[PDB]
Design a protein around this ligand. Structure first.
Ligand SMILES: [Cl-]
Length: 132
């Protein structure tokens, strides 16, 4: 009937994120995008931590070829130039969504936007995808 599947994404926490500013811990939040529909969500910001615990879930409507991209950002850098405060991402293509769904919480290593990028990215994000 609909050409989509409802997947509940829980963004549980991240751990061991990069500390880019020596004297100043980030205030991390995650941003979630379903690439084909453009569906966009953000978690709350957690103050002054490399190990933010968000425990927030989102009902994503994912189409047959859509992916889910989750990126982590230091909100203290919100006014700085575009792309500052980047702390890593993960991209789940439709095959990975198919594999991971209903397998429980997964520790996913955060990646640079591209393998060859300079950005210091460290640590993991912990998420689950469930079919609803
Ligand atoms: Cl940062």
């Amino acid at each position: 009937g609909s050409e989509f599947i409802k997947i509940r994404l829980t963004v549980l926490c991240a751990k061991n994120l990069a500390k880019k500013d020596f004297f100043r811990l980030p205030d991390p939040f995650a941003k979630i995008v379903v690439d084909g529909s453009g569906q966009c969500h953000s978690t709350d910001t957690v103050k002054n931590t490399l190990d933010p615990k968000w425990n927030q879930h989102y009902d994503l409507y994912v189409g047959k070829t859509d992916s889910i991209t989750i990126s982590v950002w230091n909100h203290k850098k919100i006014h700085k130039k575009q792309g500052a405060g980047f702390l890593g991402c993960v991209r789940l293509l439709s095959n990975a969504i198919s594999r991971l769904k209903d397998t429980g919480y997964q520790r996913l290593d955060l990646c640079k936007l591209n393998p060859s990028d300079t950005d210091a990215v460290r640590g993991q994000i912990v998420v689950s995808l469930q079919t609803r």
